A paper describes a structure:
One target protein for c‐di‐GMP is PilF, a hexameric ATPase from the thermophilic bacterium Thermus thermophilus important for pilus formation, cell motility, and DNA uptake from the environment. The N‐terminus of PilF contains three homologous so‐called general secretory pathway II (GSPII) domains, GSPII‐A, ‐B, and ‐C. Our recent structures of GSPII‐B (PilF159‐302) showed that the two nucleotide building blocks of c‐di‐GMP are recognized by the protein in a very similar manner through a duplicated amino acid sequence motif.
To gain insights into the structural basis for the pH‐dependent ligand recognition, we crystallized both the Q190E and the Q218E single‐site mutant of the PilF GSPII‐B domain in complex with c‐di‐GMP using very similar crystallization conditions at pH 7.0. Due to the high‐quality electron density maps for both mutants, their ligand recognition mode could be discerned in detail. In both the Q190E and the Q218E single point mutants, one phosphodiester‐binding pocket can be found in the mutant configuration and the other one in the WT configuration due to the duplication of the c‐di‐GMP phosphodiester binding motifs. Importantly, the carboxylate groups of the newly introduced glutamate sidechains in either of the two Q/E mutants were found to still point directly towards a non‐bridging oxygen atom of the phosphodiester groups for the carboxamide groups of the native glutamine side chains. The shortest distances between the oxygen atoms of the glutamate carboxylate groups and the phosphodiester groups were found to be 2.6 Å (Q190E) and 2.5 Å (Q218E), respectively, which is well below the sum of the van der Waals radii of the two oxygen atoms. Similarly, the hydrogen bond length between the L168 amide group and the phosphodiester oxygen in the Q218E mutant is increased by 0.2 Å compared to the native binding site in the Q190E construct (orange numbers). While the c‐di‐GMP binding affinity of the WT protein is similar at pH 4.0 and 8.5 according to ITC titration experiments, both mutants display a drastic increase in ligand affinity at lower pH. Likewise, the KD of the Q218E mutant changed from ∼ 450 nM at pH 8.5 to ∼ 25 nM at pH 4.5. For the Q218E/c‐di‐GMP‐complex and the free Q218E protein, pKa values of 7.1 and 5.9 were determined.
Numbering used by the authors: 164 to 301
Write the structure that this text describes.
Amino acid sequence: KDLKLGELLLQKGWISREALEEALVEQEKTGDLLGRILVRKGLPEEALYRALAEEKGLEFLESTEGIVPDPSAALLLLRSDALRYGAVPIGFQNGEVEVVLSDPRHKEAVAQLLNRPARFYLALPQAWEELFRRAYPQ
Ligand SMILES: Nc1nc2c(ncn2[C@@H]2O[C@@H]3COP(=O)(O)O[C@H]4[C@@H](O)[C@H](n5cnc6c(=O)[nH]c(N)nc65)O[C@@H]4COP(=O)(O)O[C@H]3[C@H]2O)c(=O)[nH]1
């Protein structure tokens, strides 16, 4: 009985009940992702990602600018896999690989593929792409 995205945003005070109902009513007609509807209707994208991070047990990263990606960690995923799964392995801490995700929905698929202890972070789209390109030059 974990909270869903809308319930989490409501509890955090970042959307109103009327805004949530409005987004759910549209989703019932369109099938769009709820967070995408809420951001279109005015929720800050960062508010969405903070809530998605909490929902999935990920640490939200406010910036990727200070990360120096460990080349040893990046070898654990082929570049094509890092891009498709939206996952950048950036280093190691106490025998866990640190991995920055672009989409919380991919956490399980990435964790299965890595098949080793890992610590997962979530970064905003622009921040993630900057990090990916530094870790995986083409
Ligand atoms: N990268 C990304 N991920 C997103 C986004 N929006 C939602 N998600 C994530 O994708 C899953 C599916 O969202 P959905 O298709 O809108 O399907 C959702 C939505 O239809 C719906 N629902 C979500 N929140 C609420 C709520 O507060 N009240 C009610 N009655 N239904 C909700 O339950 C379904 C499952 O919700 P969740 O457990 O929270 O699981 C969510 C959530 O983990 C987005 O914009 N970007």
